[PDB]
Amino acid sequence: SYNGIRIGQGYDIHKIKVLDEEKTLTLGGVKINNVLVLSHSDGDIIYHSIVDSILGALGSLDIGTLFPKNSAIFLRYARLLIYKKNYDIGNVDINVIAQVPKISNIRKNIIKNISTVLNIDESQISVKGKTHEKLGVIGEKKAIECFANILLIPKN
Amino acid sequence: SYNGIRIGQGYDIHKIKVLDEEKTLTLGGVKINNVLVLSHSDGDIIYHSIVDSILGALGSLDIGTLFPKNSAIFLRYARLLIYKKNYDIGNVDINVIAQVPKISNIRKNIIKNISTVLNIDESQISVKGKTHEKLGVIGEKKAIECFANILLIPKN
Amino acid sequence: SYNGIRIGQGYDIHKIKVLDEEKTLTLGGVKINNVLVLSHSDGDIIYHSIVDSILGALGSLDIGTLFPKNSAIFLRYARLLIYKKNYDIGNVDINVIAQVPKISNIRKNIIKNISTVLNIDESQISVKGKTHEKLGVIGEKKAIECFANILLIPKN
Numbered sequence: 141s142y143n144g145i146r147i148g149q150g151y152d153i154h155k156i157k158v159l160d161e162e163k164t165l166t167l168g169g170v171k172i173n174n175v176l177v178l179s180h181s182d183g184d185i186i187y188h189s190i191v192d193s194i195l196g197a198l199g200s201l202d203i204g205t206l207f208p209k210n211s212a213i214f215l216r217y218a219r220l221l222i223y224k225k226n227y228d229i230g231n232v233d234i235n236v237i238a239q240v241p242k243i244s245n246i247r248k249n250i251i252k253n254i255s256t257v258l259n260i261d262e263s264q265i266s267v268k269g270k271t272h273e274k275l276g277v278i279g280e281k282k283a284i285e286c287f288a289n290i291l292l293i294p295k296n
Numbered sequence: 297s298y299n300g301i302r303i304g305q306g307y308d309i310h311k312i313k314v315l316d317e318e319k320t321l322t323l324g325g326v327k328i329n330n331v332l333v334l335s336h337s338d339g340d341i342i343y344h345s346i347v348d349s350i351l352g353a354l355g356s357l358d359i360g361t362l363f364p365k366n367s368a369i370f371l372r373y374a375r376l377l378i379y380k381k382n383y384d385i386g387n388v389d390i391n392v393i394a395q396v397p398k399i400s401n402i403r404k405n406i407i408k409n410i411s412t413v414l415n416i417d418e419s420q421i422s423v424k425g426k427t428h429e430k431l432g433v434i435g436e437k438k439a440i441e442c443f444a445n446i447l448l449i450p451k452n
Numbered sequence: 453s454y455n456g457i458r459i460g461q462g463y464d465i466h467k468i469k470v471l472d473e474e475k476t477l478t479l480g481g482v483k484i485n486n487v488l489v490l491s492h493s494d495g496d497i498i499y500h501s502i503v504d505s506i507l508g509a510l511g512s513l514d515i516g517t518l519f520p521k522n523s524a525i526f527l528r529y530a531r532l533l534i535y536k537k538n539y540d541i542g543n544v545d546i547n548v549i550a551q552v553p554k555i556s557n558i559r560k561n562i563i564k565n566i567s568t569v570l571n572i573d574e575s576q577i578s579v580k581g582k583t584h585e586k587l588g589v590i591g592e593k594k595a596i597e598c599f600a601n602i603l604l605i606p607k608n
């Protein structure tokens with residue numbers, strides 16, 4: 141059983157519809173009032189990819205597989221899983237690849253939200269937004285995706 | 297010469313054709329009998345991205361460049377390269393981004409296959425599958441891609 | 453304030469135009485004379501994603517947000533930021549996902565360029581090129597993208 145330092149990378153992608161001129165997206169727990177997310181879940185690519193990076197770091201079955209609204213249940217889950225396995229989080233670096241919304245505007249709020257739900261300091265979190273040159277599925281605003289990269293550090 | 301902890305990220309993408317109604321894919325050493333992979337190589341995005349994450353972690357020339365069927369030759373290669381450089385693998389986290397096949401169904405078999413070819417425990421491996429909302433090249437089943445993230449830990 | 457080992461992942465994407473038969477791209481500080489990059493910046497996905505992986509590792513505001521030609525100003529910035537925070541770089545692994553140009557041909561020059569601008573050894577750098585099966589925005593040569601993965605190691 142390996143108990144050294146662990147890497148995780150979560151990935152998520154959700155279909156969206158921008159309320160331009162011809163269910164509301166939540167991103168890092170922040171409501172995005174001009175974008176709908178077309179999903180059975182709440183569409184929070186940031187929360188879901190963070191859960192997936194934790195699960196991945198530790199080698200668990202993923203969320204859908206484990207449990208066959210929901211985003212907070214899973215994040216609390218992931219936090220308590222790191223605890224029971226005797227790890228702390230080192231830092232997490234999140235890349236949201238999204239033509240809309242702009243992330244810089246809501247970045248402080250996402251970071252505080254993550255830090256509360258993971259119970260870690262704001263200095264252990266980075267959330268960055270990248271547009272996609274208005275090319276492809278993302279750049280045409282049909283979808284948004286997120287990569288979350290995390291290190292877990294063995295306690296003591 | 298740096299001998300501390302090392303990060304690697306491998307990436308791979310292969311063209312596929314799903315045998316719907318109008319050479320066989322291998323994924324993590326598992327044959328996928330309803331999908332053809334259109335490739336000169338065996339199309340194993342999982343094996344190839346794992347090799348590339350190891351090579352990347354250590355700063356080698358990549359597979360094609362190094363050696364200008366094949367997937368086992370390269371994986372044995374990568375395992376023995378980690379050995380000769382005096383590293384062990386920490387853990388590896390693999391994200392297959394594929395509309396088909398579903399990964400959860402074959403996940404145990406891929407993990408055992410990786411653990412045998414890398415000679416590491418099953419607890420050091422995570423393999424996760426993500427669909428792509430039926431959007432773009434991946435979501436339309438024209439291709440499958442994989443990201444493999446690894447840490448190498450200096451021996452002793 | 454967390455001062456253990458840190459992970460960063462930078463991502464960047466730029467629009468390009470290949471000078472086929474019907475401003476010049478710089479990649480890892482190397483000029484690519486058959487490709488134009490359609491950008492307000494110099495289009496160096498490799499330099500920019502490296503800066504973003506450093507900023508991400510450390511939890512800074514990103515480049516555009518921090519400072520609202522340019523690629524060297526930012527890289528020197530990132531190097532001196534790692535210094536002032538009391539970190540060294542472990543290693544960096546870069547995946548350029550580009551149908552053109554081929555990276556293997558210019559890989560030595562990019563690695564020497566990175567190692568000079570970051571002031572680290574060539575053994576701490578890996579730069580890998582992956583084509584995209586001539587599918588999608590990348591495979592059709594409309595864009596090139598890069599992922600840069602880095603570990604920062606607390607001094608002493």
Ligand SMILES: [Zn+2]
Pocket residue numbers: 152153154181183184185188
């Ligand atoms: Zn999701």
Ligand SMILES: [Zn+2]
Pocket residue numbers: 153285
């Ligand atoms: Zn995508």
Ligand SMILES: [Zn+2]
Pocket residue numbers: 308309310337339340341344
């Ligand atoms: Zn391959």
Ligand SMILES: [Zn+2]
Pocket residue numbers: 309441
């Ligand atoms: Zn792709």
Ligand SMILES: [Zn+2]
Pocket residue numbers: 464465466493495496497500
């Ligand atoms: Zn850029």
Ligand SMILES: [Zn+2]
Pocket residue numbers: 465597
């Ligand atoms: Zn892309």
